[PDB]
Amino acid sequence: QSALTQPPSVSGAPGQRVSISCTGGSSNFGAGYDVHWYQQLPATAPKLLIYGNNNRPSGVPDRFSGSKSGTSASLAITGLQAEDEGDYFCQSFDTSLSGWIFGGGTKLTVLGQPKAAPSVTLFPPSSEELQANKATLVCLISDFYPGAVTVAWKADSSPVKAGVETTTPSKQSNNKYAASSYLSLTPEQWKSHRSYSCQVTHEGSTVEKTVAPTECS
Amino acid sequence: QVQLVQSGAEVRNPGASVKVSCKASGYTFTSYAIHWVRQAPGHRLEWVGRINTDNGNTKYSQKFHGRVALSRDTSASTTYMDLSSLNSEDTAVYYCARAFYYSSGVMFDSWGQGALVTVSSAPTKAPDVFPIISGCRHPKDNSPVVLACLITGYHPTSVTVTWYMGTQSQPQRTFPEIQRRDSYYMTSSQLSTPLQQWRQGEYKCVVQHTASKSKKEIFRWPESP
Ligand code: NA
């Protein structure tokens, strides 16, 4: 094969050892070309991790090690840490394509990190948005693990699904996750209720925050 | 330190062309070749081509020969990628990377931060930015207030947000961008540390949208309605 293939996903618990396979073929690994590995942490550029099958650039932890054969290569990660989560790409050169080739990438997930309940902050419409005849409620949700929540909105005590837009969660710099939910209202709707609420469900608990049109009056 | 710094995000119509730059510093520019690599959403890394920074010789991938040109300006320690006949599949982050020799091959040892090229027919629009606050501008108890900025009505992605207290950058919480039903985007940035009292203008959120060559700063949270 003139293409490198990787499992889309690998996972392990803190402290465990995983390996990421990169299968190639006779025109790349089998033609004598080395493999290199790149690490791409969330929202960052790729970084060289292993070069020449098994060499580490300065600064890369020796928990990362590589091996290579003519049919595949293997990146081993010992002592998994939450900071290792990201995408890993292999790279080689292919004679039949006359060019550099990359694997499709493997997403590494570190499961079983310590649970962390979400921090929820609810924001009412700004005075400036209301002057533009618009009203958005913003529910910001931070510092939770595992990275899965569900969000529900209420007007007074009635569930509201119209006008709701919720992001899917994304990992923060401290290995916890963040998400947001927006409720788009008209100024009439905002003013016609006693309060609005954002309810965040995570691992067997729900936390609710409430805002009221005349709170800072 | 070896560093590659690329130009900012670009938006183009289908059929147009885009020129992205990559400025090198921290080493002798002409001693190392530069490669260009792209990453579309939902696709792997893809090699675009190579340029020798000394003599200007190029090699391109068969997928792009005929509509890509690489060039270099040694006086500016810069290489350029010009990609023409743009299509929707060309929406991608374009990286430059330095080629480094070792005993039995070459590797890509240093990468630029990437430049997002969006191919779109939709009009480009700078964000509206609203100061939002959890709690009251002047709290009635001694419990803290949280500042954030609501960033809405912009196209395409993405924005970059920084917070300042005076001249000093402050910790922030970043949140995903979401596409609204009206096809524009919105996002929020939160000042991480809760506040009790501050001088008007002491804190500000700075929102950059390079696709519209714009920067907006909000430094006033006025009294609530
Ligand atoms: Na190096």
SS3 per residue for chain B: CCEEEECCCEEECCCCCEEEEEEEECCCHHHCCEEEEEECCCCCEEEEEEECCCCCCEEECCCCCCCEEEEEEHHHCEEEEEECCCCHHHCEEEEEEEEEEECCEEEEEEECCCEEEEECCCCCECCEEEEEEECCCCCCCCCCEEEEEEEEEEECCCCEEEEEECCEEECEEECCCEECCCCCEEEEEEECCCECCCCCCCEEEEEEEHHHCEEEEECCCCCCC
Distance from CA of A61 to the nearest CA of B (A): 16
Chain B residues closer than 8 Å to A34 by CB? 104-105
Note whether B7 and B115 are same-domain residues: yes
* Residues B84 and B184 grouped into a single domain: no
> How is residue B4 written in tokens?
């590659």
Rounded-to-integer distance, Cα A102 and Cα A92, Å: 7
CB A126 to CB B150 under 8 A? yes
Cα separation of B109 and B88, whole Å? Answer: 30
B103 part of contact set with chain A, CB < 8 Å = yes
d(CA B204, ligand 1 centre) in Å: 39
- Tell me which chain A residues have a C-beta less than 8 angstroms from the C-beta of B150: 123, 126, 129, 136, 138
Closest to A28 measured CA to CA, from A112, A80, A95: A95
3-state helix, strand, coil in chain A (%, to 5): 5, 50, 45
Distances (CA, A) of A136 to A55, A59, B70, B151, B217: 52, 46, 46, 11, 20
Residues B48 and B114 in one domain: yes
Q: Are residues A80 and A122 in the same domain?
A: no
Give the β-pairing of A119-123 and A64-68. unpaired
Residues of B (40-69) whose Cβ lies below 8 Å from A: 44-47, 59, 61-62
- Which of residues A112, A130, A148 is at a domain's end? A112
Q: Which residues contact A99 (CB under 8 A, 6 or more apart)?
A: A93, B47, B59, B61, B62
Does A136 reach chain B within 8 Å, measured CB to CB?
yes
Name the domain count of chain B. 2
Pick from A81, A30, A77, A85: nearest CA to A56: A77
* Cα(B183)–Cα(B212) distance, integer angstroms: 17
Are residue A42 and residue A128 in the same domain, yes or no? no
Query: What radius of gyration do chain A's Cα atoms show?
Result: 24
Nearest to A114 by CA among A149, A82, A85: A82
State the distance from the centre of ligand 1 to the C-alpha of B54, rounded, in angstroms.
19
Chain A closest-CA separation from residue B95 CA (Å):
8
Q: A57 alpha carbon to ligand 1 midpoint, in Å?
A: 6
Contact at 8 Å (CB) between B204 and B162?
A: no
Q: Which structure tokens are listed for A108?
A: 């590494």
Q: How far apart (Å, rounded) are the C-alpha atoms in residues A200 and B16?
A: 45
The answer to whether the CB atoms of B223 and A127 lie below 8 A apart is yes
- A100: which chain B residues are within 8 Å (Cβ-Cβ)? 35, 37, 47
Q: Do A17 and A97 have their domain in common?
A: yes
CA distance A182 to A23: 43
Distance from C-alpha of B223 to C-alpha of B1, rounded to nearest angstrom? 47
Contacts of B35 in chain A (CB under 8 A): 100
Q: Looking at A91, A112, A133, which one is the last position of a domain?
A: A112
CA dihedral for A49, A55, A57, A61, sign (positive or negative): positive
Nearest one of A39, A38, A44, A56 to A100, comparing CA atoms = A38
* Nearest by CB: A138 against B61, B109, B148: B148
Q: Is the dihedral of CA A187, A188, A189, A194 positive or negative?
A: positive
- Alpha-carbon span B4 to A30, nearest angstrom: 33
Q: What are phi and psi of B128, to 5 degrees?
A: -80, 145
Chosen for mutation from A48, A122, A151, A209 (greatest number of chain B CBs closer than 10 Å) is A48
Question: Is B55 in the same domain as B146?
Answer: no
Which residues from chain B sit within 8 angstroms of residue A198, using beta carbons?
none
Do B13 and B106 lie in one domain? The reply is: yes
Owning domain of residue A120:
113-214
Resolution for this model in angstroms, one decimal place? 1.5
Q: Which of B59, B105, B180 minimises the CB distance to A52?
A: B105
| Same-domain pairing of B22 and B81 | yes
Taking an 8 Å cut-off on Cβ atoms, the answer to whether A45 and B113 are in contact is: yes
**B185-191 vs B178-179, strand pairing mode:** antiparallel
Half-sphere exposure of A208 (CA within 13 A, CB side): 12
**Pair B98, B139 in one domain:** no
What is the distance between the alpha carbons of residues A5 and A23, in angstroms, rounded to a whole number? Answer: 5
- The secondary structure element, H or E, covering residue A198 is strand A196-202
The number of distinct structural domains making up chain A is: 2
Give the pairing type, strands A119-123 and A18-23: unpaired
**After which residues does chain B break, using C–N > 2.5 Å?**
none
Q: Does B154 touch chain A (CB under 8 A)?
A: no
B80-96: burial string, b at 16+ Cβ within 10 Å, e else: bbebbebeeebbbbbbb
Residue of chain B whose Cα is closest to the Cα of A8: B44
If contacts are CB pairs under 8 Å, which of residues 1-60 in chain A contact chain B?
A: 33-34, 36, 38, 45-48, 51-52, 55, 57
Q: Concatenate the DSSP letters of all residues of A63-126 into one string.
A: TEEEEE-SSEEEEEE-S--GGG-EEEEEEEEETTTTEEEE---EEEEE--PPPBPPEEEEE---
Nearest-Cα distance to chain B for A118, in Å, is 13
Listed residues A112, A146, A165: the one ending a domain? A112
- CB A126 to CB B130 under 8 A? yes
Q: Which residue has the tokens 């147009």?
A: B16
Question: Domain range spanning residue B27?
Answer: 3-119
A135 contacts chain B (CB < 8 A): no
CATH of the domain at A147: 2.60.40.10
